[PDB]
GROMACS .gro file of C-alpha atoms in nm:
model
   68
    1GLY     CA    1   2.538  -0.966  -0.327
    2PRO     CA    2   2.170  -0.860  -0.203
    3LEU     CA    3   2.087  -0.913   0.176
    4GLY     CA    4   1.792  -1.092   0.088
    5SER     CA    5   1.576  -0.893   0.293
    6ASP     CA    6   1.289  -0.824   0.017
    7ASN     CA    7   1.368  -1.155  -0.152
    8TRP     CA    8   1.003  -1.210  -0.095
    9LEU     CA    9   0.888  -0.871  -0.230
   10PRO     CA   10   0.817  -0.898  -0.598
   11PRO     CA   11   0.908  -0.658  -0.880
   12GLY     CA   12   0.574  -0.470  -0.798
   13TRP     CA   13   0.686  -0.429  -0.424
   14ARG     CA   14   0.937  -0.161  -0.399
   15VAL     CA   15   1.186  -0.098  -0.084
   16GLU     CA   16   1.343   0.220   0.040
   17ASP     CA   17   1.624   0.261   0.292
   18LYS     CA   18   1.523   0.475   0.582
   19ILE     CA   19   1.738   0.526   0.899
   20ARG     CA   20   1.584   0.555   1.246
   21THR     CA   21   1.468   0.892   1.319
   22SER     CA   22   1.487   0.861   1.709
   23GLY     CA   23   1.787   1.033   1.853
   24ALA     CA   24   1.832   0.807   2.212
   25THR     CA   25   1.845   0.469   2.057
   26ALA     CA   26   1.871   0.619   1.674
   27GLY     CA   27   2.145   0.502   1.441
   28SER     CA   28   1.984   0.200   1.304
   29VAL     CA   29   1.805   0.124   0.990
   30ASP     CA   30   1.477   0.047   0.859
   31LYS     CA   31   1.347  -0.018   0.496
   32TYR     CA   32   1.018   0.051   0.404
   33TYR     CA   33   0.804  -0.133   0.135
   34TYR     CA   34   0.555   0.077  -0.112
   35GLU     CA   35   0.295  -0.102  -0.300
   36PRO     CA   36   0.215   0.072  -0.630
   37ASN     CA   37  -0.116  -0.142  -0.652
   38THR     CA   38  -0.286   0.097  -0.422
   39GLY     CA   39  -0.006   0.287  -0.308
   40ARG     CA   40   0.048   0.128   0.019
   41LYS     CA   41   0.349   0.178   0.202
   42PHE     CA   42   0.512  -0.046   0.502
   43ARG     CA   43   0.762  -0.041   0.766
   44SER     CA   44   0.789  -0.364   0.875
   45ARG     CA   45   0.763  -0.685   0.680
   46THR     CA   46   0.552  -0.812   0.948
   47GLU     CA   47   0.290  -0.524   0.855
   48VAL     CA   48   0.342  -0.617   0.500
   49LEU     CA   49   0.281  -0.970   0.552
   50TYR     CA   50  -0.066  -0.899   0.726
   51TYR     CA   51  -0.171  -0.718   0.444
   52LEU     CA   52  -0.099  -0.978   0.187
   53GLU     CA   53  -0.261  -1.234   0.413
   54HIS     CA   54  -0.584  -1.058   0.410
   55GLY     CA   55  -0.516  -0.949   0.049
   56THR     CA   56  -0.597  -0.580   0.159
   57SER     CA   57  -0.601  -0.320   0.410
   58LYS     CA   58  -0.932  -0.383   0.519
   59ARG     CA   59  -0.908  -0.142   0.783
   60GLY     CA   60  -1.229  -0.078   1.013
   61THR     CA   61  -1.336  -0.007   1.344
   62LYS     CA   62  -1.349  -0.233   1.682
   63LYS     CA   63  -1.410   0.006   1.949
   64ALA     CA   64  -1.724   0.055   2.176
   65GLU     CA   65  -2.008   0.299   2.062
   66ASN     CA   66  -1.889   0.549   2.324
   67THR     CA   67  -2.218   0.743   2.312
   68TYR     CA   68  -2.477   0.865   2.535
   0.00000   0.00000   0.00000
C-alpha cells in the first residue's frame, strides 16, 4: 500500500522520487513536489508546508543595502 508521505498533498500536487545525488552519504531517497498551479517544485514537505502556509512564494529581500 502507499507510504502515505504525500497523504497530505492533493491530486493537484505531484510527487516524484529522486535518489540522493551525493556520494559520500548518498544512497538515500528524496521525493519532490510539483505544483502545476505555478509550476513550483519542492524538495522537502517542510518547504511545501511553508509555501502553502503563506499561500505563495512571496520571495523578497531582507539584506542590508550594502551600498556606498
